[PDB]
Amino acid sequence: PNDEATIKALDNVIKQIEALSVIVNRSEKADDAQILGPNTYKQLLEHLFS
Amino acid sequence: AVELEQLAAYGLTGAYPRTNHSVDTIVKTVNNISATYSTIAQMLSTIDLD
């Protein structure tokens, strides 16, 4: 057997396993809420007499 | 699998196999086969066997 192939295989396996165990999962999404800007009422026309 | 006409032509002329290489080359090739199987065998036995 060639002893220069086992070392290469071990290198590849170790490097792959270590590259797999570094990536992390993290998100920064906001919430579905709203802003609710200001508002005022408005009056409808009316007629008055006495 | 051979066709009948080819076999008949081969037998009619009385052909025989011939070669120009030596015996060392073939045994070297067989040793190469054995080496390439043993390399993978020990790689599996040292990395994967579980």
Coordinates of C-alpha atoms in Angstrom, one line a residue:
Chain A
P1 CA 0.0 0.0 0.0
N2 CA 0.9 3.6 -0.7
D3 CA 1.2 5.6 2.5
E4 CA 0.8 9.0 0.6
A5 CA -2.9 8.4 -0.2
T6 CA -4.2 7.7 3.3
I7 CA -2.7 11.0 4.5
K8 CA -4.5 12.9 1.7
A9 CA -7.8 11.2 2.5
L10 CA -7.5 12.0 6.2
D11 CA -6.7 15.6 5.3
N12 CA -9.7 15.9 3.1
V13 CA -12.1 14.3 5.6
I14 CA -10.8 16.4 8.5
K15 CA -11.0 19.7 6.5
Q16 CA -14.5 18.9 5.3
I17 CA -15.8 18.0 8.8
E18 CA -14.3 21.2 10.2
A19 CA -15.7 23.4 7.4
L20 CA -19.1 21.8 8.2
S21 CA -18.9 22.6 11.9
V22 CA -18.2 26.4 11.7
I23 CA -21.3 27.6 9.8
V24 CA -23.9 29.0 12.1
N25 CA -27.5 29.9 11.7
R26 CA -28.7 33.4 12.7
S27 CA -31.5 35.7 11.5
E28 CA -32.4 39.4 12.1
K29 CA -36.0 39.6 10.8
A30 CA -38.4 42.2 12.1
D31 CA -42.0 41.8 13.4
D32 CA -45.2 42.0 11.4
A33 CA -46.3 45.0 13.4
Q34 CA -47.2 48.5 11.9
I35 CA -46.3 52.1 12.5
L36 CA -49.8 53.6 13.2
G37 CA -49.3 57.2 12.2
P38 CA -51.5 60.0 13.5
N39 CA -54.9 61.0 12.3
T40 CA -57.8 63.3 13.0
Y41 CA -61.6 63.2 12.7
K42 CA -63.5 65.1 10.0
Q43 CA -67.1 66.4 10.4
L44 CA -69.8 66.0 7.8
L45 CA -72.1 68.7 6.6
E46 CA -75.1 69.6 8.8
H47 CA -78.1 71.9 8.5
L48 CA -79.6 73.7 11.5
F49 CA -82.6 76.0 12.0
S50 CA -85.1 76.9 14.7
Chain B
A1 CA -19.7 -14.2 -28.0
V2 CA -18.3 -14.7 -31.5
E3 CA -20.0 -15.3 -34.9
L4 CA -19.7 -18.6 -36.7
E5 CA -17.9 -17.3 -39.7
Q6 CA -15.2 -15.6 -37.6
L7 CA -14.6 -18.8 -35.7
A8 CA -14.5 -20.9 -38.8
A9 CA -12.0 -18.5 -40.5
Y10 CA -9.9 -18.6 -37.3
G11 CA -9.9 -22.4 -37.3
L12 CA -9.2 -22.8 -41.0
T13 CA -6.0 -20.9 -41.0
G14 CA -4.8 -22.5 -37.8
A15 CA -4.0 -19.2 -36.1
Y16 CA -2.4 -19.0 -32.6
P17 CA -2.0 -16.1 -30.2
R18 CA 1.4 -14.4 -30.3
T19 CA 3.2 -11.7 -28.3
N20 CA 6.4 -9.7 -28.1
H21 CA 6.5 -8.6 -24.5
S22 CA 8.3 -10.4 -21.6
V23 CA 7.0 -12.0 -18.5
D24 CA 8.2 -9.3 -16.1
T25 CA 5.8 -6.7 -17.5
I26 CA 2.7 -8.7 -16.8
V27 CA 3.7 -9.6 -13.3
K28 CA 4.5 -5.9 -12.7
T29 CA 1.0 -5.1 -13.9
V30 CA -0.6 -7.7 -11.5
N31 CA 1.5 -6.3 -8.7
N32 CA 0.2 -2.8 -9.6
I33 CA -3.4 -4.1 -9.4
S34 CA -2.7 -5.6 -6.0
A35 CA -1.1 -2.4 -4.7
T36 CA -4.0 -0.3 -5.9
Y37 CA -6.5 -2.5 -4.1
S38 CA -4.5 -2.6 -0.9
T39 CA -4.2 1.2 -0.8
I40 CA -8.0 1.6 -0.7
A41 CA -8.3 -1.4 1.7
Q42 CA -6.1 0.2 4.3
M43 CA -7.7 3.7 3.7
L44 CA -11.1 2.2 4.5
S45 CA -9.8 0.2 7.5
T46 CA -8.2 3.4 8.9
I47 CA -11.0 6.0 8.2
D48 CA -14.4 4.3 7.6
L49 CA -14.5 0.9 9.3
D50 CA -17.1 1.1 12.0

